[PDB]
A paper describes a structure:
Amongst these family members, [name] is unique in that channel activation, in addition to elevated lateral membrane tension, requires the presence of certain external ions such as K+, Rb+, or Cs+ 32–34. The [name] [name] ([name]) channel, consisting of 1120 amino acids, contains a large N-terminal periplasmic domain (PD, ~500 amino acids), a transmembrane domain (TMD) with eleven predicted TM helices, and a cytoplasmic domain (CTD) analogous to that of EcMscS. To better understand the biophysical underpinnings of mechanotransduction and to establish the molecular basis of dual activation in a ligand- and force-gated channel, we have determined cryo-EM structures of [name] in distinct functional states by leveraging GOF mutants.
Thus, the cryo-EM datasets of [name] in NaCl and in KCl were essentially indistinguishable, which allowed us to combine the datasets to further improve the reconstructions of both the closed and open conformations to overall resolutions of 3.84 and 3.47 Å, respectively. The final atomic models fit well into their respective densities and were refined to good stereochemistry. The lower resolution reconstruction of the WT channel is nearly identical to the closed conformation of [name], and hereinafter the higher-resolution structures of [name] are primarily used for structural analysis and interpretation. The innermost pore-lining helix TM11 contains an apparent kink such that TM11a defines the transmembrane ion-conduction path and TM11b runs nearly parallel to the membrane plane and extends to the cytoplasmic CTD. Akin to EcMscS and AtMSL1, the pore-lining helix (TM11) in the resting state is kinked, and several bulky hydrophobic side chains point to the central pore axis to create narrow constrictions. A hydrophobic gate near the cytoplasm is constituted by V921 and F925, which are conserved amongst [name] homologs. It appears that [name] possesses two physically separated hydrophobic gates along the pore: an upper periplasmic gate and a lower cytoplasmic gate. The periplasmic gating ring is primarily held together by packing interactions of inter-subunit three-helix bundles, in which one of the interfacial helices engages its entirety at the interface in the closed conformation.
Numbering used by the authors:
A (entry chain A), B (entry chain B): 897 to 1097
Amino acid sequence: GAMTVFGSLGVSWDKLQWLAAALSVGLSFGLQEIFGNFVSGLIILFERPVRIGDTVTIGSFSGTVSKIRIRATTITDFDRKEVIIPNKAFVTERLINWSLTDTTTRLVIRLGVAYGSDLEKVRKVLLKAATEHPRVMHEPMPEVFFTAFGASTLDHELRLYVRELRDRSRTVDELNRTIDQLCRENDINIAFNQLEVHLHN
Amino acid sequence: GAMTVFGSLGVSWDKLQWLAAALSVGLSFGLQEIFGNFVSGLIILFERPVRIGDTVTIGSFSGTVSKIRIRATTITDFDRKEVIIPNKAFVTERLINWSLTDTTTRLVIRLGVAYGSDLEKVRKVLLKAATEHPRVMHEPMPEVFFTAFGASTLDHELRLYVRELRDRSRTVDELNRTIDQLCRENDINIAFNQLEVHLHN
């Protein structure tokens, strides 16, 4: 209606078309964030860097991608808190996916040992607990590492492997239970924080 | 279809081509993030700043680069959490690579000693433990440094060298085990946190 009113009285389309074009660019630089999203979605769909069913972490948002679209991707979190992520972050921003070519993952079990202990006994107990599990992988050998002279307790890390991304927590539960039972049986001290006080009067 | 309908009724291509060009730039500034990625990938491929098989750290993401492409680079993390990084961060953003010209690295072993100890004895024990290893390099001499008058314990650092980037942790394990054994043998006190309390009533 405004265009018709202006044309029927002023008729200056050939006069304000340049202003229209300048305003058009100055105000259509608002669609960059949308067209980039669309192009990123198309690129993701064509290249297939992530597939449906794997675990993806981006921006401290780890979860299983459920549906992929041309505008936004839906990731079901571990609490079914559906996260909607623009595909521009999927294309032009770095991400992590845990199931790409080998669907295997290593996990660490950290513990502290008292200063007056037996490092060889602790290593044997940890290795036996890791090996006795009927699920941990054997081709990559699980190892125990002495990695830190802690302020109160020496730090020990057991880096061991799981080939299934689903049960990454039940294995940790069983391993920790077995480690605690073996430590209690073999009398390995897991000391608390320690300090020395000098007192007078 | 819309173009044909507009042309067959209005025929104003020569009238809205300027608006088309303005919108084209305003909405094709959405491909900057993609073309920069492509050009960065091409530049990385030509210049070869990083090769396949070395260890690269960028944005707190350290791992071994597996495949390099024109759009995104794949880095297998230490947990096989495949990180997909746009090559724009590889070209226009700083990074670190541990295997460029000499594939060697120095590592530090930190420990604390009690105030009432023998600094010369501690230095001798640390140097003997560092030297007795059959892997640490000898051309750069390993040294022990007294670097901090700590609040509770004096801080000692052993900076020693490894020429292989693969076994950077097993050497640390063996060195720490040997250091602990030698300290226990020679009676060197690794004190905990200490404080003094004044009490009354």
